[PDB]
Amino acid sequence: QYDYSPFCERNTLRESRIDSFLKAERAAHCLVFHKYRPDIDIMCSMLLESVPGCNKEDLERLSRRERLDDIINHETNALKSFWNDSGLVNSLQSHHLHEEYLLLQEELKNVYKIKCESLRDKCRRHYSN
């Protein structure tokens, strides 16, 4: 029988939640495992396996301590990095890629500024705060 001791230290769980957890858990594992029960099984050169936003080629560069079609290649590639291998971009129509791209560097450029006074006046900030 399906074990549910870790999900709730209370020894008894109502049957609706037992199926609620079992159905939810199998789907969550099946998403990660595939791009069955949890209690039967939990299982399954540079050390660095992965970093957000880096492709395999970026890893090899790290290990070494380092026109419309072409822009469309650069159109998709930037969203490959930002969306962490999202499969919906291939389903997006071409002209919807342009406006999201224009807003991409626009919001990124705003981050660069954020990431980057008289004696009498500058004392007030400390007193008022």
Binding site: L119, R120, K122, C123, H126, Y127
Partner: protein, 152 residues
């Protein structure tokens, strides 16, 4: 001072920041104003962003009426550490040097709020309160200044 002259080598004397601070404070106590400034400037040359005790330098430069040096030191000291009472007491000393003194009193009280166990901010408050022509506040501030440091 004689021990400095005799028992202290010159190379250690003119390099050690602690010797510079102690010698400047000592020459302050003997009311030797010219001597102390040219060694405290050397101390600032060793490190501008050091606090320890600038209450002595602030007291000296208030007498010497050097507004620009006090402004630079106050700006640097606040930029380095805002929570140190010495920076706020230096700022208040500069403010009293300028003209206005109510905000100087408020800054001094804020410095005392940062560290209640700072007796020199208390005695500086009391000394300033004489310029306000008020005595009862001054006398209470003096007594509470003595409470912190028995031998002042």
């Amino acid at each position: 001072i004689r021990l400095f002259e005799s028992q202290i080598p010159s190379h250690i004397k003119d390099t050690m920041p602690w010797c510079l601070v102690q010698l400047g404070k000592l020459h302050f106590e003997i009311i030797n104003y010219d001597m102390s400034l040219k060694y405290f400037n050397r101390l600032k040359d060793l490190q501008p962003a050091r606090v320890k005790d600038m209450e002595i330098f602030s007291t000296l430069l208030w007498h010497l009426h050097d507004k620009v040096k006090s402004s630079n030191l106050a700006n640097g000291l606040m930029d380095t550490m805002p929570n140190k009472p010495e920076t706020w007491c230096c700022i208040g000393n500069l403010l009293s040097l300028q003209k206005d003194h109510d905000a100087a009193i408020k800054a001094f009280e804020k410095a005392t709020q940062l560290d209640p166990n700072f007796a020199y901010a208390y005695t500086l408050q009391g000394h300033e309160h004489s310029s306000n022509d008020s005595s009862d506040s001054a006398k209470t501030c003096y007594r509470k200044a003595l409470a912190c440091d028995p031998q002042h």
